[PDB]
Design a protein around this nucleic acid. Structure first.
Lengths: 386, 65, 136
RNA sequence: CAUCUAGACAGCCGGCCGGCCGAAUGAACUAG
RNA sequence: UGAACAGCCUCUAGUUGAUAGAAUAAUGUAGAUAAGGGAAGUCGGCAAAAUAGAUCCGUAACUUCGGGAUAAGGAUUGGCU
RNA sequence: UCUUAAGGUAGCCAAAUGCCUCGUCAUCUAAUUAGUGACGCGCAUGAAUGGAUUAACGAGAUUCCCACUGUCCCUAUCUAC
RNA sequence: CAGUCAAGCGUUCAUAGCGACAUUGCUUUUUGAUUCUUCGAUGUCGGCUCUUCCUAUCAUACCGAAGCAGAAUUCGGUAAGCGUUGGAUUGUUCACCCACUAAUAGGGAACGUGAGCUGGGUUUAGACCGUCGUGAGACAGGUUAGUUUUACCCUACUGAUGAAUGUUACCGCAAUAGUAAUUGAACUUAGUACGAGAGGAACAGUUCAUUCGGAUAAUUGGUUUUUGCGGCUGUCUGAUCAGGCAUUGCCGCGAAGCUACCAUCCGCUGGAUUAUGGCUGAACGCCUCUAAGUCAGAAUCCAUGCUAGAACGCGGUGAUUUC
């Protein structure tokens, strides 16, 4: 018999299977279509989602009800210290897919990235890249030969980089290594740029710009085994249902005599990789720039870090990306920011954003103040204040 | 943008922080938090609530400044 | 939105589902309006159509003037008790639900509005703005 | 069944015929 | 305490028995709370919620005149002097 | 006029009894096969095979109203096992 | 449910839309016919929930035709990608109304779905009525009350590990399978086109919104065993302080976590095509979108992007145990 009343299906079937991510750092599956006109630059960056905060700005879209009026918007502040370039991996294109040809590493690797190559760094002999850093001796003849072979056969050039996670307040000292594709001149220009930038840092203000429309790629917040009612949003069964009501009633008809794949079933929720596109940047701050939490209208002496630090994370002391709206993943988690895959010419994305006020009130509850100076002025001198 | 003043508490309300209440007689109250909002709905006297700016003003708490 | 809505009403948190009763803010003699449907509402397997500030809903006068009673008739919600968020960032609500009786075009059947109304409703319906003593 | 270098049909031109143009064409019907 | 061999706490008396340890997933069983609306759910207000003690006021139709009646509907409630 | 032993009287009803039937009218609702009040050529109501009404009573059946609420819109969270 | 013919309707006129007398069909969504399977039981109506499929398409996309001036509407083609509701009454399928909407299209999956629910109906035993019976009793006639049992097995599905391919680690590829966005309104075009007038849009652009989906908790709201602070009752510790108990004693507030269209953000662009409209151009010296060839074009298909990564597909790289 036909379904008596039609209803849209629960959940999205294009995000299956809802299993855990392969690793805690989501892979950038696709990269912007390279053109060989603009100078060589990275097509992504690695950061750590510090948290969220509130901002005020003038909406600047003609024809709207709020044109030239205040709006309050939620933004996510991502801690993004400059990433160190450590290796160049060349890619040839084969009928079986793009295949890596060779990787050439830098002579000296930092301890925080050498930790990535061990699971038991505390007791390891730390021999990684010993017989490779010895290959840079005698003016690196093999290294230059390998780079020449990369130029000879390399259709796409990606650079291995890692985050200076020791700059973050995270407890983990094992850095994350990632491949970011170089978009720019020819293969020789790309590899020459990477060789110049061996064991050298790249800061965010050189890859991203203000009002740029980016994508955030990250593994979402894990939630363990979850019932169908919250995992797919199916209707809860009536209150008087035997054997429980947080289920799906009919999991399929008699024929086909199998449970269909498209049926909501209990399983893991969260901890999947997610690429969320079209988030606009609102401010690319500088870590060494104190009072970066103020604006031309605010003009206070407060940094982006709220009072009492970002909850569960700490303070912000490096270059950050303040991106409008939420991004997948929770705090402390690495997130890969990426340039937009298409030229988004919509008037919602072509706006010029000038932040009018950046909140710094404590995220640890309902705090009333932005700065300790403001709090002291409002509350007067306390007994502990002596 | 501008910072408001709590109607019950006197605490500053920064944009988006708190709630706004419109009584039947069109009187406008702004509450920095559910604490102040719930106290107001319970109709406790701000003059009598110890930590309120109204209580501080009445009892000259820190008024020597 | 409605057929005669004069502008765009940004989404206001729906806080008046079908079957709700809201005091007749206007002065047509009706006491309360009982919502039976909402203009512009969507469809789902069991979702109740719901109103908001400025929504034009088909309502019925359960209590009040006998000639007004016992017939369907359009109304416009002017006060909503469910707190909603303006684009300015503030969360606000009125102390009571309240609507005004009107024809489908938009003109109020009543002559004056008691109590305050919402800025969204006043902006959407010019007649409500004209007959509204205080707008907030 | 008919028209058919005793200029077929078509096409353009002149006022139903003729000029070009040279060889098959038109109608109904039957079955694979 | 209270109207009370009601409920709650204690004295004499008696037990401390019921496999246990670690974590806190889904679904459960039992207990709960929920903004706005208020039966629109469902066969059906099923389950739940609401009221509740005491004092004072007020109490309709109907009636076999006995009742209905705690009708309905309101107010007060501590401590201390 | 046929006919019976007598031919449903007083009463009551789409009633728990009415097939047609979701009868017809009114009221209740925005909308009612439900409820109630009427109409009665009642397939097939009706007089201690008891008829009609009835105050009180009812873990009986049913409708509406106020209050009330996670029954629901539309789900979320907490605790014990 | 669909064709074929055409007497007529359609002012005029068969075929814009219809279409009698007739005739050929299709479907198993009705009801029958049969009795082939099951009576050492296949749980039996409806509703709730959920998935998928069909197309004989209600709407949305692009078009063809009209008794298409506009607007509205009707017929039709490709099309099932995407949606197709809230309620009154009834157990009802059905039906009939109320109302919104772009629309409230028809169906299947053992008349989908009872070790998923419910038990309103039917469908035991109690009971009442009416008719039929002398009677026991009969009535798809009415009414009321009536236990809905078991999964830990195998498979299927959802998630989760996992042996070996010298070991171990890092960075990758991507065969394959899935896939997603949807619809409306307002302003402007413009009171313009069209029209005598009444009436009266579209293409582009802007702001939003509906339905769906993936996240996130800055804000607001919810939750409270933070039993965190404060308060309160009864009792108990001689009184005070401080506490115990009342299955978390109750109340007010309550961070953090989780969470809500009850909150916020986001949801991409290229090719090839169908229908259809065209070009060149014969067949057939004429002509024709067609036969050769070829252009634009649908919510279509395949890509871009997104998801998982074959645990028997693979690559690059590091270190690789002697006292």
């Amino acid at each position: 018999s036909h379904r008596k009343y039609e209803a849209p299906r629960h959940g999205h079937l294009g995000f299956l299977p809802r299993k855990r991510a392969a690793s805690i750092r989501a892979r950038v599956k696709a990269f912007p279509k390279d053109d060989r006109s603009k100078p060589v630059a990275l097509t992504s960056f690695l950061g750590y989602k510090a948290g969220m905060t509130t901002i005020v700005r003038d909406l600047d879209r003609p024809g709207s009800k709020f044109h030239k009026r205040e709006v309050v918007e939620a933004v996510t502040v991502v801690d993004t210290p400059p990433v160190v370039v450590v290796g160049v991996v060349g890619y040839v294109e084969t009928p079986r897919g793009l295949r890596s040809l060779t990787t050439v590493w830098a002579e000296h690797l930092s301890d925080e990235v050498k930790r990535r190559f061990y699971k038991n760094w505390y007791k390891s002999k730390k021999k990684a890249f010993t017989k490779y850093s010895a290959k840079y001796a005698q003016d690196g003849a093999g290294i230059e030969r390998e780079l020449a072979r990369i130029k000879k056969y390399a259709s796409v050039v990606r650079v291995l980089v890692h985050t200076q996670i020791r700059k973050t307040p995270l407890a983990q000292k094992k850095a994350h290594l990632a491949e970011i594709q170089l978009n720019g001149g020819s293969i020789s220009e790309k590899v020459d740029w990477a060789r110049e930038h061996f064991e050298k840092t790249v800061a965010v203000d050189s890859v991203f710009e203000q009002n740029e429309m980016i994508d955030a790629i990250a593994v979402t917040k894990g939630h363990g085994f979850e019932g169908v009612t919250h995992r797919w949003g199916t209707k809860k069964l009536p209150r008087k249902t035997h054997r429980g009501l947080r289920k799906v009633a009919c999991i399929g008809a008699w024929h086909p005599a199998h449970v269909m794949w498209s049926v909501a079933r209990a399983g893991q929720r969260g901890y999947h990789s997610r690429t969320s596109i079209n988030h606009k940047i609102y401010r690319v701050g500088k870590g060494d720039d104190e009072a970066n939490g103020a604006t031309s209208f605010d003009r206070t002496k407060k940094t982006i870090t709220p009072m009492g630090g970002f909850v569960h994370y700490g303070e912000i002391k490096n270059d950050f990306i303040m991106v409008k709206g939420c991004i997948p993943g929770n705090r402390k988690r690495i997130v890969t920011l990426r340039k937009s895959l298409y030229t988004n010419t919509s008037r919602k994305a072509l706006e010029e954003v000038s932040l009018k006020w950046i909140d710094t009130a404590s995220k640890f509850g309902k705090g009333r103040f932005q700065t300790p100076a403001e709090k002291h002025a409002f509350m007067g001198t306390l007994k502990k204040d002596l | 943008m501008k910072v408001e003043i709590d109607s019950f508490s006197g605490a500053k309300i920064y944009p988006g922080r708190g709630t706004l209440f419109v009584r039947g007689d069109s009187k406008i109250f702004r509450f920095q938090n559910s604490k102040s909002a719930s106290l107001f709905k319970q109709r406790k006297n701000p003059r009598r609530i110890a930590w309120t700016v109204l209580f501080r003003k009445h009892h000259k708490k820190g008024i020597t400044e | 939105s409605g057929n005669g809505a004069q502008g765009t009403k940004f989404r206001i948190s729906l806080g008046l589902p079908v079957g709700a009763i809201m005091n007749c803010a206007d002065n047509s003699g009706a006491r309360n309006l009982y919502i039976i449907a909402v203009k512009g509402s969507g469809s789902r397997l069991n979702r109740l159509p719901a109103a908001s500030l400025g929504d034009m809903v088909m309502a019925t006068v359960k209590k009040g003037k006998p000639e007004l009673r016992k017939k369907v008739m359009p109304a416009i919600v002017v006060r909503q008790a469910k707190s909603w968020r303006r684009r300015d960032g503030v969360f606000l609500y009125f102390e009571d639900n309240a609507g005004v009786i009107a024809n489908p075009k938009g003109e109020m059947k009543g002559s004056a509005i008691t109590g305050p109304v919402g800025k969204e409703c006043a902006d959407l319906w010019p007649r409500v703005a004209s007959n509204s003593g205080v707008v907030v």
